[PDB]
Design a protein around this motif. Structure first.
Motif, PDB file in Angstrom:
ATOM      1  N   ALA A   1     -29.689 -24.036 -40.163  1.00 40.97           N
ATOM      2  CA  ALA A   1     -30.034 -24.802 -41.356  1.00 40.97           C
ATOM      3  C   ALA A   1     -30.610 -23.899 -42.437  1.00 40.97           C
ATOM      4  O   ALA A   1     -30.260 -24.028 -43.616  1.00 40.97           O
ATOM      5  N   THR A   2     -31.495 -22.976 -42.056  1.00 40.17           N
ATOM      6  CA  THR A   2     -32.042 -22.034 -43.026  1.00 40.17           C
ATOM      7  C   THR A   2     -30.946 -21.146 -43.601  1.00 40.17           C
ATOM      8  O   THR A   2     -30.950 -20.838 -44.799  1.00 40.17           O
ATOM      9  N   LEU A   3     -30.011 -20.707 -42.755  1.00 42.46           N
ATOM     10  CA  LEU A   3     -28.894 -19.904 -43.239  1.00 42.46           C
ATOM     11  C   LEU A   3     -28.087 -20.675 -44.275  1.00 42.46           C
ATOM     12  O   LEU A   3     -27.761 -20.153 -45.348  1.00 42.46           O
ATOM     13  N   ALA A   4     -27.774 -21.936 -43.977  1.00 41.18           N
ATOM     14  CA  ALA A   4     -27.064 -22.762 -44.944  1.00 41.18           C
ATOM     15  C   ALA A   4     -27.866 -22.899 -46.230  1.00 41.18           C
ATOM     16  O   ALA A   4     -27.306 -22.850 -47.331  1.00 41.18           O
ATOM     17  N   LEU A   5     -29.186 -23.060 -46.111  1.00 47.51           N
ATOM     18  CA  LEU A   5     -30.010 -23.291 -47.292  1.00 47.51           C
ATOM     19  C   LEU A   5     -30.036 -22.071 -48.204  1.00 47.51           C
ATOM     20  O   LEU A   5     -29.855 -22.198 -49.420  1.00 47.51           O
ATOM     21  N   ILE A   6     -30.266 -20.875 -47.648  1.00 47.15           N
ATOM     22  CA  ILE A   6     -30.334 -19.706 -48.528  1.00 47.15           C
ATOM     23  C   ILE A   6     -28.948 -19.216 -48.910  1.00 47.15           C
ATOM     24  O   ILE A   6     -28.827 -18.381 -49.816  1.00 47.15           O
ATOM     25  N   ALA A   7     -27.894 -19.708 -48.250  1.00 45.39           N
ATOM     26  CA  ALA A   7     -26.548 -19.486 -48.761  1.00 45.39           C
ATOM     27  C   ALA A   7     -26.258 -20.390 -49.952  1.00 45.39           C
ATOM     28  O   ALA A   7     -25.611 -19.965 -50.917  1.00 45.39           O
TER      29      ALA A   7
ATOM     30  N   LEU B   1     -30.460  -7.757 -42.327  1.00 47.72           N
ATOM     31  CA  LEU B   1     -31.589  -7.148 -43.021  1.00 47.72           C
ATOM     32  C   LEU B   1     -31.904  -7.839 -44.340  1.00 47.72           C
ATOM     33  O   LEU B   1     -32.960  -7.567 -44.922  1.00 47.72           O
ATOM     34  N   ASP B   2     -31.024  -8.712 -44.824  1.00 48.46           N
ATOM     35  CA  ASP B   2     -31.297  -9.435 -46.059  1.00 48.46           C
ATOM     36  C   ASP B   2     -32.552 -10.284 -45.908  1.00 48.46           C
ATOM     37  O   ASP B   2     -32.733 -10.987 -44.909  1.00 48.46           O
ATOM     38  N   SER B   3     -33.423 -10.212 -46.908  1.00 46.59           N
ATOM     39  CA  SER B   3     -34.648 -10.991 -46.952  1.00 46.59           C
ATOM     40  C   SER B   3     -34.603 -11.935 -48.145  1.00 46.59           C
ATOM     41  O   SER B   3     -33.756 -11.813 -49.035  1.00 46.59           O
ATOM     42  N   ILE B   4     -35.533 -12.892 -48.157  1.00 40.05           N
ATOM     43  CA  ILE B   4     -35.593 -13.846 -49.259  1.00 40.05           C
ATOM     44  C   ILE B   4     -35.846 -13.111 -50.569  1.00 40.05           C
ATOM     45  O   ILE B   4     -35.313 -13.483 -51.622  1.00 40.05           O
ATOM     46  N   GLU B   5     -36.669 -12.060 -50.527  1.00 43.76           N
ATOM     47  CA  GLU B   5     -36.920 -11.269 -51.727  1.00 43.76           C
ATOM     48  C   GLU B   5     -35.645 -10.601 -52.226  1.00 43.76           C
ATOM     49  O   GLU B   5     -35.373 -10.589 -53.433  1.00 43.76           O
ATOM     50  N   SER B   6     -34.850 -10.039 -51.314  1.00 45.41           N
ATOM     51  CA  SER B   6     -33.685  -9.260 -51.724  1.00 45.41           C
ATOM     52  C   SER B   6     -32.656 -10.130 -52.435  1.00 45.41           C
ATOM     53  O   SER B   6     -32.117  -9.745 -53.479  1.00 45.41           O
TER      54      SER B   6
ATOM     55  N   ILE C   1     -44.900 -21.392 -45.112  1.00 41.50           N
ATOM     56  CA  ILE C   1     -44.332 -20.450 -44.155  1.00 41.50           C
ATOM     57  C   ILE C   1     -44.852 -19.068 -44.527  1.00 41.50           C
ATOM     58  O   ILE C   1     -44.367 -18.447 -45.481  1.00 41.50           O
ATOM     59  N   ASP C   2     -45.838 -18.583 -43.775  1.00 38.33           N
ATOM     60  CA  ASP C   2     -46.446 -17.295 -44.079  1.00 38.33           C
ATOM     61  C   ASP C   2     -45.416 -16.179 -43.954  1.00 38.33           C
ATOM     62  O   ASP C   2     -44.687 -16.099 -42.961  1.00 38.33           O
ATOM     63  N   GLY C   3     -45.356 -15.318 -44.968  1.00 42.24           N
ATOM     64  CA  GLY C   3     -44.462 -14.181 -44.938  1.00 42.24           C
ATOM     65  C   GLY C   3     -43.004 -14.504 -45.159  1.00 42.24           C
ATOM     66  O   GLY C   3     -42.159 -13.617 -45.001  1.00 42.24           O
ATOM     67  N   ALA C   4     -42.676 -15.744 -45.529  1.00 37.91           N
ATOM     68  CA  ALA C   4     -41.275 -16.112 -45.708  1.00 37.91           C
ATOM     69  C   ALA C   4     -40.622 -15.279 -46.803  1.00 37.91           C
ATOM     70  O   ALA C   4     -39.465 -14.862 -46.671  1.00 37.91           O
ATOM     71  N   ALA C   5     -41.347 -15.028 -47.894  1.00 39.95           N
ATOM     72  CA  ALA C   5     -40.777 -14.263 -48.997  1.00 39.95           C
ATOM     73  C   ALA C   5     -40.420 -12.846 -48.563  1.00 39.95           C
ATOM     74  O   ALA C   5     -39.364 -12.322 -48.940  1.00 39.95           O
ATOM     75  N   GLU C   6     -41.284 -12.211 -47.772  1.00 38.99           N
ATOM     76  CA  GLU C   6     -41.077 -10.824 -47.374  1.00 38.99           C
ATOM     77  C   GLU C   6     -40.344 -10.687 -46.047  1.00 38.99           C
ATOM     78  O   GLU C   6     -39.705  -9.656 -45.808  1.00 38.99           O
ATOM     79  N   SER C   7     -40.415 -11.695 -45.180  1.00 39.41           N
ATOM     80  CA  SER C   7     -39.762 -11.601 -43.881  1.00 39.41           C
ATOM     81  C   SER C   7     -38.250 -11.508 -44.048  1.00 39.41           C
ATOM     82  O   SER C   7     -37.656 -12.180 -44.895  1.00 39.41           O
ATOM     83  N   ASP C   8     -37.629 -10.665 -43.226  1.00 43.82           N
ATOM     84  CA  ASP C   8     -36.184 -10.499 -43.263  1.00 43.82           C
ATOM     85  C   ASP C   8     -35.500 -11.747 -42.703  1.00 43.82           C
ATOM     86  O   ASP C   8     -36.145 -12.699 -42.252  1.00 43.82           O
ATOM     87  N   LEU C   9     -34.165 -11.739 -42.733  1.00 49.53           N
ATOM     88  CA  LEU C   9     -33.417 -12.883 -42.225  1.00 49.53           C
ATOM     89  C   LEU C   9     -33.638 -13.066 -40.730  1.00 49.53           C
ATOM     90  O   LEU C   9     -33.709 -14.198 -40.243  1.00 49.53           O
ATOM     91  N   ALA C  10     -33.737 -11.966 -39.980  1.00 55.52           N
ATOM     92  CA  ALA C  10     -34.001 -12.074 -38.549  1.00 55.52           C
ATOM     93  C   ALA C  10     -35.354 -12.725 -38.293  1.00 55.52           C
ATOM     94  O   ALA C  10     -35.461 -13.687 -37.519  1.00 55.52           O
ATOM     95  N   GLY C  11     -36.403 -12.212 -38.938  1.00 52.71           N
ATOM     96  CA  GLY C  11     -37.719 -12.803 -38.773  1.00 52.71           C
ATOM     97  C   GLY C  11     -37.780 -14.228 -39.282  1.00 52.71           C
ATOM     98  O   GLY C  11     -38.428 -15.087 -38.677  1.00 52.71           O
ATOM     99  N   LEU C  12     -37.112 -14.499 -40.404  1.00 58.57           N
ATOM    100  CA  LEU C  12     -37.080 -15.858 -40.935  1.00 58.57           C
ATOM    101  C   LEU C  12     -36.436 -16.812 -39.937  1.00 58.57           C
ATOM    102  O   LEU C  12     -36.958 -17.902 -39.673  1.00 58.57           O
ATOM    103  N   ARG C  13     -35.298 -16.413 -39.365  1.00 63.88           N
ATOM    104  CA  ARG C  13     -34.626 -17.248 -38.377  1.00 63.88           C
ATOM    105  C   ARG C  13     -35.518 -17.475 -37.165  1.00 63.88           C
ATOM    106  O   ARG C  13     -35.652 -18.603 -36.677  1.00 63.88           O
ATOM    107  N   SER C  14     -36.151 -16.408 -36.672  1.00 65.95           N
ATOM    108  CA  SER C  14     -37.005 -16.541 -35.498  1.00 65.95           C
ATOM    109  C   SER C  14     -38.157 -17.500 -35.767  1.00 65.95           C
ATOM    110  O   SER C  14     -38.447 -18.386 -34.954  1.00 65.95           O
ATOM    111  N   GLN C  15     -38.815 -17.354 -36.919  1.00 67.22           N
ATOM    112  CA  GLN C  15     -39.990 -18.173 -37.198  1.00 67.22           C
ATOM    113  C   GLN C  15     -39.608 -19.623 -37.469  1.00 67.22           C
ATOM    114  O   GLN C  15     -40.330 -20.540 -37.062  1.00 67.22           O
ATOM    115  N   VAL C  16     -38.481 -19.861 -38.145  1.00 73.29           N
ATOM    116  CA  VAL C  16     -38.069 -21.241 -38.388  1.00 73.29           C
ATOM    117  C   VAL C  16     -37.654 -21.908 -37.082  1.00 73.29           C
ATOM    118  O   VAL C  16     -37.942 -23.089 -36.857  1.00 73.29           O
TER     119      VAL C  16
END
Lengths: 402, 179
Positions: free
Chosen positions: B11-17, B30-35, B60-75
């Motif tokens: 769902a997060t992948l769909a959202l940031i796509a 390696l893509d992050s929300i910032e990038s 979501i703490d660190g969502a802006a800086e967390s990479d896609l892997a970390g974002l997926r894991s935390q979500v």
């Protein structure tokens, strides 16, 4: 728990500002009804209609206003809508029992007035709305401009963190570029300690500024470290606006209540142009005097002890109105307020447990600022929980299970 | 094959796509929300609120800086009870389906049917295929010159076109998931 209430500034408006709040509570509905009735009786429009819908144009008592993307984005109407929404949210919190009483009031450049009206009650919401609307209407025409409507001032946000520039020398760098170009450049908003600032000034000066910023950026590394703030074209909190201060002071003196209790704000209000906690100390008055000129305050300095003894209320009101008037002309100092709020009690600063802001879910700017400041490496053990009055209603009102 | 569970990560992948008009395949780990936003804060607030609404979660703490892997894991760790199609994703997918199937007049269920009977797969694969169809059938241009829509160009207007687009979506979904 010792808390702080932060009321956001501009850039937060959007069609349908928390109508769900109006529908949920019964006190929020009452305050909305009172506010809209008063504003349609006196001002000439229905703030409820301006918020629930976003009309392209409206007709006030005598004059009429228009805007391609809704009247809600003009200064006057966005101001009244923000004040009404903040009052509704605070009333809803207070009727539910989850509103601490002795909280200290703070706000961004314009939220300060709403915060005072909401969490202290020094003046009622009606006078706030009236004065805010009148001042906002007067503001738009306080700067000479072309007949096409374009002005000679713009403000943009810079992010000197990726330029390698440090906090200490940012004003020096801005002054240097101003001298180099011989233009008018001035810091206005000190939002984030490291990676956010607002600079307002002339056009050509701004062009030199982001040209230099982009050159340094491409020298160091891609960050997109310059965003030109859109729409707003008045240099708020700059020296140039120090001509209209007299009329605003006169209006505040006319409208501000005569007999007020200084205990209602002492140690309970964090002014903006002077971040120190509001206090009845000679040093505070001296600082507010030497930071910016204040003729009515001069008589305070000459004799202080006896005047404090005999006219505490009068002198408190005088300092309060002087501060409130000069606030809209001098830069906001949000960095100092945040640092004073988050530093623990031992290191000469207020120890605040929860930092909750009366904002909206869509664009929680102040909550983002607080979280960004907290995550800085300066302090990583700060146990200062940051809340938003709409995003985290579940945990703010304590109706969250697991 | 075994059905693929559409979890909070998907769902997060769909959202940031959708927010950046990106494609799930064209985004790297390696893509992050910032990038993706290139520092655009205007988009940052909207994207964060959209993610929170989809995950029904607050900050979501660190969502802006967390990479896609970390974002997926935390979500995934936080949004354990994620609902198949939340508000933001629901409106995005259904509106894109209208705008791409107007002349054709096909409904989302039909798409799922092709993943159930024509392809003999579970409902999770059907949801993934519908998401892929919605993402790849949009119009526009990518940020860095990529193909904004890879499955089809323009609104579908015949049963054959929608069927072949769904087949290509199934093939791409299997390829990215190794099926």
């Amino acid at each position: 728990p010792k808390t702080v209430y932060a009321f956001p500034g501009q850039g937060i408006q959007h069609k349908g500002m928390g109508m769900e709040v109006r529908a949920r509570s019964k006190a929020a509905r009452k305050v909305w009804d009172t506010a809209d009735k008063f504003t349609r009786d006196t001002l000439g429009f229905s703030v409820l209609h301006v918020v629930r819908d976003n009309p392209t144009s409206i007709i006030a008592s005598g004059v009429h206003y228009h805007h391609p993307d809704g009247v809600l984005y003009l200064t006057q109407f966005t101001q009244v809508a923000m004040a009404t929404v903040a009052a509704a949210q605070v009333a809803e919190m207070r009727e539910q029992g989850a509103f601490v009483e002795g909280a200290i009031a703070c706000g961004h450049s314009v939220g300060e007035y709403t915060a005072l009206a909401c969490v202290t009650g020094i003046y009622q919401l009606e006078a706030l709305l009236e004065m805010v609307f009148h001042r906002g209407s007067k503001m738009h025409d306080i700067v000479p401009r072309d007949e096409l409507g374009r002005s000679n001032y713009r403000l943009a946000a810079i992010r000197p963190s990726q330029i390698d520039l440090d906090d200490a020398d940012v004003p020096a760098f801005v002054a240097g570029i101003a001298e180099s170009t011989g233009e008018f450049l001035e810091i206005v908003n000190f939002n984030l300690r490291g990676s956010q600032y607002a600079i307002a000034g002339t056009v050509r000066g701004l062009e030199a500024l982001e040209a230099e910023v982009e050159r340094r950026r491409e020298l160091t590394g891609g960050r997109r470290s310059f965003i030109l703030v859109p729409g707003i074209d008045v240099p708020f909190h700059s020296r140039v606006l120090r001509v209209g201060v007299a009329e605003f002071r006169r209006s505040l003196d006319r409208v501000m209540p005569r007999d007020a209790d200084p205990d209602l704000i002492i140690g309970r209000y964090i002014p903006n142009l002077v971040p120190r906690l509001f206090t009845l100390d000679r040093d505070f008055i001296q600082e507010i005097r030497d930071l910016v000129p204040a003729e009515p305050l001069d008589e305070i300095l000459a004799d202080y002890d006896t005047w404090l003894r005999e006219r505490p209320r009068e002198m408190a009101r005088t300092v309060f109105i002087e501060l409130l008037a000069w606030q809209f002309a001098s830069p906001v100092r949000w960095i100092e307020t945040q640092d004073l709020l988050f530093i623990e009690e031992a290191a000469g600063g207020l120890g605040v447990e929860r930092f909750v802001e009366i904002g909206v879910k869509s664009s929680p700017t102040v909550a983002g600022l607080a979280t960004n400041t907290l995550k800085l490496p300066e302090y990583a053990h700060s146990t200062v929980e940051v809340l938003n009055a709409e995003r985290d209603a579940a945990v703010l009102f304590a109706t969250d299970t697991d």
